Amino acid sequence: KYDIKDISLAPQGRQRIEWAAREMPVLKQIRERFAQEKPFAGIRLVACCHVTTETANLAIALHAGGADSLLIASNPLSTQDDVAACLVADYGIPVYAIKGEDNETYHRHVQIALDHRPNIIIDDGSDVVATLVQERQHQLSDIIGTTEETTTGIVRLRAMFNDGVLTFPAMNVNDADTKHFYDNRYGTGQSTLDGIIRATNILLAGKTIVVAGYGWCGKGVAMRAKGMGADVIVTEISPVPAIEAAMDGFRVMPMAEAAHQGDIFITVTGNKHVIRPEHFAVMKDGAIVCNSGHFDIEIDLKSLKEQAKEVKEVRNFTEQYILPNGKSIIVIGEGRLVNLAAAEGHPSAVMDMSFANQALACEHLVKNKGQLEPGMHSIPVEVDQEIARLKLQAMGIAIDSLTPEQVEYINSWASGT
Amino acid sequence: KYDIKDISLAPQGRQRIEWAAREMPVLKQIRERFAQEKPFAGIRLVACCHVTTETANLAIALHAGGADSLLIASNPLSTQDDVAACLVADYGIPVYAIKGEDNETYHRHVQIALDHRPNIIIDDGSDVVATLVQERQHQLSDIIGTTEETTTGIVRLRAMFNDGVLTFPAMNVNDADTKHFYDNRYGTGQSTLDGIIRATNILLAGKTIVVAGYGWCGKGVAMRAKGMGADVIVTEISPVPAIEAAMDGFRVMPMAEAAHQGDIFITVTGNKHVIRPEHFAVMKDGAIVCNSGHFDIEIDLKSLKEQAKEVKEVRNFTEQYILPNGKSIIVIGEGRLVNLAAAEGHPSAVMDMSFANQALACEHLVKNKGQLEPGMHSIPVEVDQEIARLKLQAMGIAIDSLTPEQVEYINSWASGT
Amino acid sequence: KYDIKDISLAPQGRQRIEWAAREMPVLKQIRERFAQEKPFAGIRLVACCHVTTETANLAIALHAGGADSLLIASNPLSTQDDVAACLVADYGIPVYAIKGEDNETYHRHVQIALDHRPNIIIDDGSDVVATLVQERQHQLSDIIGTTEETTTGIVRLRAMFNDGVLTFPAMNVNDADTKHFYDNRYGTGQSTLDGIIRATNILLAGKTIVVAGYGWCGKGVAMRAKGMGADVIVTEISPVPAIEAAMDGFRVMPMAEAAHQGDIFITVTGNKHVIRPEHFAVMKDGAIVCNSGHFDIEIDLKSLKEQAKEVKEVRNFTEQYILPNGKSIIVIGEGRLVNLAAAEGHPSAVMDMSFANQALACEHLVKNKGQLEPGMHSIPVEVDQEIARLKLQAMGIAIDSLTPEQVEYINSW
Amino acid sequence: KYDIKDISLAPQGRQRIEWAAREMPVLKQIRERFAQEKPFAGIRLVACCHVTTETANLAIALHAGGADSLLIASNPLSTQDDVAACLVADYGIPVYAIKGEDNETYHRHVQIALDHRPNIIIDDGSDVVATLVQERQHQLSDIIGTTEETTTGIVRLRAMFNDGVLTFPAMNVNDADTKHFYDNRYGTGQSTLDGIIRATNILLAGKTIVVAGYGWCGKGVAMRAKGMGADVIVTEISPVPAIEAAMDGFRVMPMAEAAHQGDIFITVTGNKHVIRPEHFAVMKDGAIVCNSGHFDIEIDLKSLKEQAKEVKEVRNFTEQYILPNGKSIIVIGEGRLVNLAAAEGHPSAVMDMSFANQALACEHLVKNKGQLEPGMHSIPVEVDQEIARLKLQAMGIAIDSLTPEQVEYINSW
Ligand SMILES: NC(=O)c1ccc[n+]([C@@H]2O[C@H](COP(=O)([O-])OP(=O)(O)OC[C@H]3O[C@@H](n4cnc5c(N)ncnc54)[C@H](O)[C@@H]3O)[C@@H](O)[C@H]2O)c1
Ligand SMILES: NC(=O)c1ccc[n+]([C@@H]2O[C@H](COP(=O)([O-])OP(=O)(O)OC[C@H]3O[C@@H](n4cnc5c(N)ncnc54)[C@H](O)[C@@H]3O)[C@@H](O)[C@H]2O)c1
Ligand SMILES: NC(=O)c1ccc[n+]([C@@H]2O[C@H](COP(=O)([O-])OP(=O)(O)OC[C@H]3O[C@@H](n4cnc5c(N)ncnc54)[C@H](O)[C@@H]3O)[C@@H](O)[C@H]2O)c1
Ligand SMILES: NC(=O)c1ccc[n+]([C@@H]2O[C@H](COP(=O)([O-])OP(=O)(O)OC[C@H]3O[C@@H](n4cnc5c(N)ncnc54)[C@H](O)[C@@H]3O)[C@@H](O)[C@H]2O)c1
Ligand SMILES: Nc1ncnc2c1ncn2[C@@H]1O[C@H](CO)[C@@H](O)[C@H]1O
Ligand SMILES: Nc1ncnc2c1ncn2[C@@H]1O[C@H](CO)[C@@H](O)[C@H]1O
Ligand SMILES: Nc1ncnc2c1ncn2[C@@H]1O[C@H](CO)[C@@H](O)[C@H]1O
Ligand SMILES: Nc1ncnc2c1ncn2[C@@H]1O[C@H](CO)[C@@H](O)[C@H]1O
Ligand SMILES: [Cl-]
Ligand SMILES: [Cl-]
Ligand SMILES: [Cl-]
Ligand SMILES: [Cl-]
Ligand SMILES: [Rb+]
Ligand SMILES: [Rb+]
Ligand SMILES: [Rb+]
Ligand SMILES: [Rb+]
Ligand SMILES: [Rb+]
Ligand SMILES: [Rb+]
Ligand SMILES: [Rb+]
Ligand SMILES: [Rb+]
Ligand SMILES: [Rb+]
Ligand SMILES: [Rb+]
């Protein structure tokens, strides 16, 4: 009925879940309304998320709303075993997630999740939805809709749409303003460095840190690396973010040129093989590589393993690969999302807004069942904006409002001298 | 045939125009192609722009393209008289612009510009287009299309559209990525502080600087104020930018609360009466107010003039208003765009991209004459992106490109474990 | 002969210790020379330090020099049990330090250390040196010199001197340029935020963080707090650093004013009761307080415990005090050094320079026995400067040198 | 008796001078007391300063104190002609300074100044003091004391001392905390970028800016360059500041390596020929070079003029040197202090503290006549500290003070 490491961890999990809730007031307000209105009565739901204290708070909100949920891990290394135990023991929510599970177990958990015959699927990376569409065409009648948490998953869903197989509504949670403006940027910025520091306790100041990608995540990682005293190099494939990085004070160059200069490399591109053997070959002795994109394939670790003569664990979450010429490359978190693998992921303050979008996106799918076209849907503007209003209020920040006279001016095109 | 301060200033103007061109290579490339292809042969054009060295380089590019142009000032205080002289004397381009001209002269220049019967109108603030639509309905057959440089003008054009009177194509230059991502942000950031410093030589470090608005301009002004050692307060009307400002490290509060704390106030909202008598009344003795939004109406200077018992000029571009209770309020640039009134406006590096958009937007209007719907048009993505590619190249910055294998991964929705 | 938690944790300690050595290249060379020259032959030593991977690497250097060393914890919560086990087990260095040891056990270890009859005492807070002066006047015959690692220890030594009881050479390690320009500033800046984040995983961006003190540590904490997106308030008692903080972009104000605004309070003053009952009473519901200065007494936790009707642990290293009106005050690390209590302390890069100073200051005391005047002695400038040169080289950074004509120009007027 | 450009510019000078006074509150109070006590009664004085609105406010303070003052320019390009006219016309203070005066005229003014037989000399670069020692040995009978405003002047005085010719009291104004912690750092940081921008209106964001020297000025310039979006490289000759720059996030390297990367070079070293012919030869086409340290000799412009086949003025304060291969080198301010040559120098806020030091250092020299030992004397700590207190108060910032028990805790060990 579940598959977890150790249910005796539930008390620790409960404590950390309650602490996380302190900065998730928006989701708390949503949970209390769900508790009354039960939008998910009779709905079966699968969530493929990072099994964290923040995901637990989302699961509790969906549970209050009546959802018959089943949670599986989005990544083998991000699972928090105490959280899994608490969800099973305290809430009776089936969880199939073991920190460190092998790929066979991960894939079996996806099969178990699809056997739940979900009506709603919350995905983080689109693994489950892709598996649904590829292997479970006979189940598609169950689907009211799905949601997608992260940028990599949105890219996959776009490919599904262009391939003609996205035959149901999918909510683009990642691209909501109150999601990727804060989660992807400020959350990833802090928690990526957190993971690197918990793994290595390395001094960031004075180090050359290479950030691959200058999108929402790259901007955050570079900003916080800079804030911690690092010399920051940015790599890119598109000129607009490249000019931005330069005018933000960072050096921009091709990865081949960055490869011999970086002390720490951090990939946040969403793309495959951004760091390759031709790069490993020129890296400093002891260069550190890690990834905060969704999938570890941003770094060609398979080639690194094949080239290296020895690999050994030298600290928690930290492996030293020794190359035939004696130089070493350090890898954190086995190349998996370093903030979640070596630390705890984003602080709950930003996950409050991301998972408020998840909850209200699920509600949107059910309230509009039978009225949404197949394909990708953006979060409604009014929902996006109300999440922002509520979060600003809960942060204790007050701002101004337009007067009628100011509205009159906006609408009066004739005036201006 | 023109109306300028002093044509003997042309040699100084020529020198400053040539210097500005050094960081406008993208526009230079466009000018050389226009010189060959003459896209504006037989076209009459009016430009209502800030009469700066950067605008002169745009005017020279349009002139090379065959445009029969006429230039008027977008603001009485932004005109550079040496630039006006050089355009008339060296290029024979009619200019109607005198730094410090009164409102009657400004309005007469708009009338002269409309009497040119332009086919294309480049506007900065939409004064000329609004006057065209309100007073010159009988001329609309001349119009191939117009362009708009700034955010205030886009807002006016939206009101014209909603009012049913935008009956021709208008290119939204401001909202091109290569325009407001750099011009509005990094350009305004540097040149606003430049104007304040040229006006007052005040030490920015240790001062509390209140930035009204956290859009593209507000982000830039806050970023550079912070970079110069100021304590930064941000005011807003919308929660998304408000949360952003907080997570960027700034204090966010209503203007009423900021009013008693700020040493320098900078308005960049695009809206009317953001600083009002109720704010003046609680400001520190010697508080400085200035505006970098397009129109000075962001500050209620009319009420300040009526309240004050004395006003006197205390330094270039700097007025001291003494209130009946003896406290003083300092105003820079008479509330007109402070970067252009008290300094030289944006550096040419960013105007290279803004005015490349202007030139290519004008070309777009002519090449597509008879095929564009009335209403607002965005800059085509391929044009926007090519400007970015060329600017990055001219900045000497190299970046990466996706491999076929990386493209295959983007398109393969099934893979990911 | 040792008092540790679990000797079976030694492999993990050695793992983390060698990892830490990777960015201790300067101390490596000093230890390499020590094993060749054995400065500390027949010299017994006590170290009262934080029991960390970096302190271990220092102890390994003194051992390499022939030192007969004994290590005790400087703070019951900073001790790393795997490091204590590795030292006892892989090097034969007696360690008396157990993470979370009570007050009795702490001073029982200080009594064991002085029963070692140390010739050299390395101190971090002036705790053992102050006990030696107080209770072991008969043992002063054995002291060649002592060293002090922290600002608070330097302040107490100055009072010992002014009191007329600093009757031996004391090396001011903290005030060496290569120590507190970097350790106190860059080290404390990063590792203090590290401790807060490991304790709470709180988002720092958008929070108001109040930093009490703008000395070396305060500058570092404020700089990194700001770098992580916080609105930073600085409190002070001296005008020069107060003006600096304002010109660095921070809001300077009295603590009574900061108390109603701060989301997180960090004390780095070296002084007693900087956060007081009258501040708790006006703090925001859920305000976090922690200390990175000395001991814990920077926060008046005794008064907080009296104002509060309930206290509970709510996360690792994190206590929630609930006041009668229902508002809470969060305390991290029981008011002890938050970087060492909730995390691992400074990265080894900065401790490389701090502990190279320690190792050479110990070398100085020994090589100048019976030649040192009583009182405090600063690190020699050449030593301080050589550490910087070695570190800069180890970091792979090259700089310029004056040409003969540039020298000739400095001399003419 | 005066040598200025145009006495009719005086109203504009007085306008700008009083504006500058608004953020010179500390100097205001000192001048207020001076007019009451007249410390400089019967005392003749020379000032060799930059002829700015802030220097004017200093001269007005010495005049208020009874000073018989004469002012000459410290740099032919820093002189503000309207300020010179206002001083002559509104206060009767002889000024010998003309913006853009040639070399002959400069030293003709230095000869006029010493013919004033000054009892006090305020110097900015040690120019007049070095001429007094060289040529006016007979006038040393008149010297009560002198003062020096800049690091370069301090270095030359040290050589005068070591040479055995500093036979009078010299006040080290530059090294007072309230002077170079702020003026040299925050003042130079802003006003150097101000000069570059007024000269060129170049976008600083996205440029690589090379800062030669990481002392007080270099830290300030690098900090603000970075704040304005530049990629900052720092060069150095000393390891301690080099490590600081790296830990502050800047790229540290030899100038030979920086020369091929920099878009803008800023020298703040105090030393000769820091940018040399072998650097010009590898610079990017259009690289900008300027100096904010001393004199101009930090950049080897003599060699540049020889490498170049042509030079032309291309904007105010801006020259383009074109080399035989067609590449250009841009020089701002003819290599003179770019903040003062192309802009207005430091804002008066920082000069408030620098010139309060000057005014009180002059008070010190006079009130201790015949009591000062020959050589350099630092600003008394109480004076330095009182300036900070007054400034902090004037800025509207309040801070804390220790309670009696907190004091009692500092003293116990
Ligand atoms: N670890 C976390 O907690 C977390 C949180 C949010 C998102 N993410 C992941 O981070 C990744 C990036 O997300 P985002 O929102 O920043 O995406 P984004 O689309 O906003 O930006 C990605 C950027 O990377 C650039 N890029 C692409 N390929 C590149 C290459 N080969 N080299 C250099 N730059 C390249 C793109 O041009 C773009 O600017 C995704 O995989 C996303 O799922 C992780
Ligand atoms: N001076 C320059 O050289 C220059 C350059 C570009 C744009 N501009 C002008 O700057 C202004 C702002 O442009 P932008 O591109 O940043 O626009 P924007 O739409 O990106 O942002 C404006 C911001 O102001 C906020 N705002 C609106 N009314 C407000 C109020 N009453 N109080 C506080 N915040 C308020 C909005 O919520 C928004 O976030 C416009 O007038 C534009 O034309 C000036
Ligand atoms: N946690 C760590 O790892 C670590 C490392 C090094 C030092 N420290 C400790 O941190 C403390 C500070 O060290 P430092 O080097 O910054 O000292 P410092 O002497 O350089 O600076 C202390 C500053 O605090 C100010 N101050 C004193 N009392 C104050 C009060 N009541 N309110 C506000 N400001 C006050 C002083 O004016 C001074 O500017 C010391 O106890 C030192 O031992 C901790
Ligand atoms: N422009 C202004 O308004 C202004 C104001 C104050 C001081 N200054 C001048 O600026 C200069 C620097 O003053 P400061 O207070 O920063 O001095 P400082 O002594 O504090 O720092 C100078 C730094 O330059 C470094 N240095 C010396 N020679 C070098 C070289 N060849 N290459 C690289 N680095 C080198 C030194 O190691 C030192 O760290 C002096 O000439 C001073 O008079 C100018
Ligand atoms: N603390 C966390 N809890 C749950 N999901 C997280 C956490 N941190 C990051 N994520 C999510 O994981 C996604 C990447 O797989 C990001 O889009 C982000 O929303
Ligand atoms: N240097 C300049 N030359 C011409 N136009 C400018 C300059 N600086 C700012 N502007 C423009 O003025 C507009 C505001 O009226 C901005 O959108 C910007 O594009
Ligand atoms: N990782 C660490 N190992 C040992 N001592 C440390 C560590 N981090 C900080 N310290 C020291 O602890 C002292 C504070 O008590 C500081 O002087 C500092 O040098
Ligand atoms: N505005 C100014 N007025 C007078 N002196 C100045 C000004 N700006 C900088 N200086 C001084 O010039 C010296 C550099 O020669 C510095 O010591 C600094 O104090
Ligand atoms: Cl709700
Ligand atoms: Cl082209
Ligand atoms: Cl050695
Ligand atoms: Cl006084
Ligand atoms: Rb995990
Ligand atoms: Rb292998
Ligand atoms: Rb309007
Ligand atoms: Rb102008
Ligand atoms: Rb009036
Ligand atoms: Rb894929
Ligand atoms: Rb610990
Ligand atoms: Rb000299
Ligand atoms: Rb000047
Ligand atoms: Rb004490």
For D155-210, give the secondary structure using H, E and C.
Answer: HHHHHHHHCCCCCCEEEECCCCHHHHHHHHHHHHHHHHHHHHHHHHCCCCCCCEEE
From atom 9 of ligand 2, which residue's Cα is the shortest distance away?
B293
Side-chain-side CA neighbours of residue A83 (13 Å): 28
CB of A339 sitting under 6 A from ligand 1: yes
Q: From residue A372, give the alpha-carbon distance in Å to each of A159, A172, A365, C73, C269.
A: 20, 14, 8, 65, 61
Burial class (CB in 10 A: 0-12, 13-18, 19+), C396: exposed
CA pair distance C408, D276, nearest whole angstrom = 17
SS3 C123: strand
The three-point CA angle D208-D211-D238 to 5° equals 135
Q: Which ligand is nearest to the CA of C156?
A: 22
Bridge partners, residue D290, by sequence:
D266
Side-chain-side CA neighbours of residue C151 (13 Å): 20
Contact B196/C237 with Cβ under 8 angstroms?
no
Bridge partners, residue A145, by sequence:
A120
Do C410 and D159 count as a contact with CB atoms less than 8 A apart?
yes
CA pair distance C286, B400, nearest whole angstrom = 47
Q: Which ligand is nearest to the CA of B39?
A: 10
Annotation-wise, does A217 bind a ligand? yes
Contact B395/A106 with Cβ under 8 angstroms?
no
CA pair distance B157, B126, nearest whole angstrom = 7
Which residues on A lie below 8 Å from C190 (Cβ)? 197, 203-205, 228-229
How many interface pairs between C and D have CB atoms less than 8 angstroms apart?
140
Contact C166/C375 with Cβ under 8 angstroms?
yes
- Ion ligand 22 neighbours (CB, 5 A) are D 409, 412
The neighbour count for residue A309, using CB atoms within 10 Å, is 10
The three-point CA angle D129-D133-D134 to 5° equals 115
**Which residue from B176, B398, D196 is spatially nearest to A245, judged by alpha carbons?**
B398
**Which residue from D258, D204, D264 is spatially nearest to D236, judged by alpha carbons?**
D258
Strands (E), C187-226: 208-212
What's B275's DSSP letter?
B
> Dihedral through CA A185, CA A186, CA A191, CA A194, nearest 10?
120
Structure tokens at B62: 């349009």
Q: From residue C167, give the alpha-carbon distance in Å to each of C48, C119, C376.
A: 20, 14, 10
CA pair distance A8, A4, nearest whole angstrom = 10
Structure tokens at C143: 């002291």
Please list, in sequence order, all residues whose beta carbon lies within 8 angstroms of the beta carbon of residue D148, skipping any fewer than 6 positions away. D123, D124, D126, D129, D154, D157, D170, D171, D172, D173, D174
Structure tokens at B55: 């605008």
**Which residue from A184, A163, A187 is spatially nearest to A175, judged by alpha carbons?**
A184
Strands (E), B150-191: 169-172
Contact B205/B228 with Cβ under 8 angstroms?
yes
Interchain contact A230–D (C-beta under 8 A): yes
The three-point CA angle A31-A35-A37 to 5° equals 110
Interchain contact D186–B (C-beta under 8 A): yes
Whole-angstrom distance between the N-terminal and C-terminal Cα of chain C? Answer: 65
The neighbour count for residue D90, using CB atoms within 10 Å, is 15
Method: X-ray
CB of D68 sitting under 6 A from ligand 8: no
Interchain contact A240–B (C-beta under 8 A): yes
Bridge partners, residue D321, by sequence:
D311, D329
Amino acid at D365: L
Contact A213/A245 with Cβ under 8 angstroms?
no
CA pair distance D248, D223, nearest whole angstrom = 9
Residue pointed to by tokens 């922002």: A388
CA pair distance A285, C401, nearest whole angstrom = 28
CA pair distance B171, B155, nearest whole angstrom = 13
Q: Which ligand is nearest to the CA of B244?
A: 2
Domain ranges of chain D: 1-185+346-397, 186-345
**Which residue from D29, D131, D11, D148 is spatially nearest to D82, judged by alpha carbons?**
D11
Give Cα D179 distance to the centre of its chain.
10
For chain C, give the secondary structure using H, E and C.
Answer: CCECCCHHHHHHHHHHHHHHHCCCHHHHHHHHHHHHHCCCCCCEEEEEECCCHHHHHHHHHHHHCCCEEEEEECCCCCCCHHHHHHHHHHHCCCEECCCCCCHHHHHHHHHHHHCCCCCEEEECCCHHHHHHHHHCHHHHHHCCEEEECCHHHHHHHHHHHHCCCCCCEEEECCCCHHHHHHHHHHHHHHHHHHHHHHHHCCCCCCCEEEEECCCHHHHHHHHHHHHCCCEEEEECCCHHHHHHHHHCCCEECCHHHHCCCCCEEEECCCCCCCECHHHHCCCCCCEEEEECCCCCCCECHHHHHHHCCEEEEEECCEEEEECCCCCEEEEEHHHCEHHHHHCCCCCHHHHHHHHHHHHHHHHHHHHCCCCCCCEEEECCHHHHHHHHHHHHHHCCCCCCCCCHHHHHHHHCC
Chains touching B (at least 3 CB pairs under 8 A) are A, C, D
The neighbour count for residue C382, using CB atoms within 10 Å, is 8
- Tally of residues, chain A: 417
Give Cα D211 distance to the centre of its chain.
17
CA pair distance A300, D130, nearest whole angstrom = 67
What's D137's DSSP letter?
G
Contact D186/D161 with Cβ under 8 angstroms?
no
Contact B347/D203 with Cβ under 8 angstroms?
yes
CA pair distance B111, A127, nearest whole angstrom = 64
CA pair distance B336, B152, nearest whole angstrom = 14
Interchain contact B392–D (C-beta under 8 A): no
Side-chain-side CA neighbours of residue B162 (13 Å): 11
What's A329's DSSP letter?
E
Strands (E), B337-387: 375-378
Data resolution in angstroms: 1.7
User: How far away is chain C from the Cα of D235, in angstroms, using its nearest Cα?
Assistant: 6
CA pair distance C78, C99, nearest whole angstrom = 7
CA pair distance D242, C316, nearest whole angstrom = 39
- List the single residue in D186, D189, D206 with the smallest CB-CB distance to B395: D206
Strands (E), D13-99: 44-49, 68-73, 95-96
Contact A15/A87 with Cβ under 8 angstroms?
no
CB of C216 sitting under 6 A from ligand 3: yes
Residue pointed to by tokens 């530049």: D230
Structure tokens at B411: 């398109």
The neighbour count for residue D161, using CB atoms within 10 Å, is 16
User: How far away is chain B from the Cα of D102, in angstroms, using its nearest Cα?
Assistant: 24
Contact A322/A309 with Cβ under 8 angstroms?
yes
What's A170's DSSP letter?
E
DSSP B329-344: EEEEGGGS-HHHHHS-
Interchain contact B194–D (C-beta under 8 A): yes
What's A284's DSSP letter?
P
